[PDB]
């Protein structure tokens, strides 16, 4: 009869799994975005160093 408590536990761990999954998603998107920005900036400053290099 007390299994409904176990069901409650299952619901809890469900919430856990979902929230941690969503967090992992936002993290992966965050790394791809940030990496892209870094690539952009380093490319820019590299280009400045190139324009200066031709001198």
């Amino acid at each position: 009869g007390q299994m409904r408590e176990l069901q409650d536990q299952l619901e809890a761990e469900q919430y856990f799994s979902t929230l941690y999954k969503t967090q992992v998603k936002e993290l992966k998107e965050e790394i791809e975005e940030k990496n892209r920005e870094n690539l952009k900036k380093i490319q820019e400053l590299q280009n400045e160093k190139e324009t200066l290099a031709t001198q």
Partner: protein, 181 residues
Amino acid sequence: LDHDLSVKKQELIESISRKLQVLREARESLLEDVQANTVLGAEVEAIVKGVCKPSEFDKFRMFIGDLDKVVNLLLSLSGRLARVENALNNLDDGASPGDRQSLLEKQRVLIQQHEDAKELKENLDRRERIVFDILANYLSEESLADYEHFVKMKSALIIEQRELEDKIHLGEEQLKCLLDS
């Protein structure tokens, strides 16, 4: 003396029944309130879809969904923790030591889960300030105030509802047990 006791029982029953009635009325009024806050939420969502780029909007909807889920999680978890806590408290002395140890273990795992959920609350608040800062630029100040009021009202209102539901349930239980007599 028996008369005094019986009439006392009747008094208690009537009082508790009154409390149950008022609490039910409160359930209806509070439900009207949840409806209204939901409509305000739909409005805010509509306004943001227009101004917000797709990524911003996905982070928004994801945010609110995670809010609801987080709140319900903390309430169910704190619920089981409270139940196990009162069970350990009123548990009879002696009986079995392995039972006391198993219940203590439940207390441990639940408290750890509570800490994890705490960290999760922190991260979620981080998300909230992120969406707040991004949306502050896009939308008006009045609609923004309506938005913030809505978001806070969703969580606080959900908790209020669940706590009230617990109280009414308990009162109904003691009432039933008392009437069986």
